[PDB]
A paper describes a structure:
To obtain molecular insights into how lipocalins function as allergens, we determined crystal structures of a major dog allergen Can f 1 (C118S, aa 27–171) and its cross-reactive homolog minor cat allergen Fel d 7 (wild-type, aa 27–170) at a resolution of 1.6 Å and 2.2 Å, respectively. Can f 1 and Fel d 7 have a typical lipocalin fold consisting of central eight anti-parallel beta strands, a flanking 310, and an α-helix close to the C-termini. The most disordered regions for both structures are the N- and C-termini. Both Can f 1 and Fel d 7 have an open positively charged calyx at the center of an anti-parallel beta-barrel.
Our Can f 1 (C118S) structure, hereafter Can f 1, has a higher resolution and contains one molecule per asymmetric unit. IgE antibodies to Can f 1 can be found in ∼70% of patients allergic to dog extract. While Can f 1 shows electron densities for most loops flanking beta-strands, some Fel d 7 loop regions are disordered: Arg44-Trp48, Glu122-Gln127, and Asn158-Glu160. While the calyx of Can f 1 is somewhat larger than that of Fel d 7, both have significantly more interior surface area and volume than other dog lipocalins such as Can f 2 (15), Can f 4 (16), and Can f 6 (17). Can f 1 (C118S) and wild type Can f 1 showed similar pattern of the percent fluorescence reduction (data not shown). Subsequent molecular dynamics simulations for 3 microseconds showed that the carboxylate of the ligands samples between the two positively charged residues (R101 and K131 for Can f 1; R102 and K132 for Fel d 7). The negative charge of the acid head group is neutralized by the positively charged environment of the calyx, either by R101/K131 or R102/K132 in Can f 1 or Fel d 7, respectively. Indeed, simulations with 2 oleate molecules confirmed that 2 oleates could remain bound for up to 3 μs to Can f 1, however 2 oleate molecules only stayed briefly bound to Fel d 7. For both Can f 1 and Fel d 7, approximately a 2:1 ratio of oleate to protein was measured. We identified that the Lys131 of Can f 1 (Lys 132 for Fel d 7) in the calyx is the critical residue for ligand binding.
Numbering used by the authors: 27 to 171
Write the structure that this text describes.
């Protein structure tokens, strides 16, 4: 499952059960690198407030396909295929910077926007009790490494 989601993605949309102050102006592609040993390394760059912010998150494999842990075990991340092909949905729960926050993210192989994938993501998000507005992200190679 790890190898299946590896490679280049576009982070299309995200939502949470809390405020999430830092809304980036744009993001570079999300790179999911499958590592020897089964873990995933997620890398993305954000343009926020006139500066380039590189983010690296190591996702640790569990016995459940698609289920990973993060941030020294204080966070769980579920990765599963969307009903629309070449899209994936992330859902995470637990601690993040010392607070309990739950998030969902929509990933797409291609930059083209899929209305069906977004609609399914909205439904998924509601079914997880993520009822804030859906935040759709701007794609750009600005700040790319």
């Amino acid at each position: 499952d790890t190898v299946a989601v590896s490679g280049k993605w576009y982070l299309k949309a995200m939502t949470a059960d809390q405020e999430v102050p830092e809304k980036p102006d744009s993001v570079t592609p999300m790179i999911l690198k499958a590592q020897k040993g089964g873990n995933l390394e997620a890398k993305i760059t954000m343009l926020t407030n006139g500066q380039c912010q590189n983010i690296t998150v190591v996702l640790h494999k569990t016995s459940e396909p698609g289920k990973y842990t993060a941030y020294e075990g204080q966070r769980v991340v579920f990765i599963q295929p969307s009903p629309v092909r070449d899209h994936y949905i992330l859902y995470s729960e637990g601690e993040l910077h010392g607070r309990q926050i739950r998030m969902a993210k929509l990933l797409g192989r291609d930059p083209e926007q899929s209305q069906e994938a977004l609609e399914d993501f909205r439904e998924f998000s509601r079914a997880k009790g993520l009822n804030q507005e859906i935040l759709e992200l701007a794609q750009s190679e600005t700040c790319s490494p």
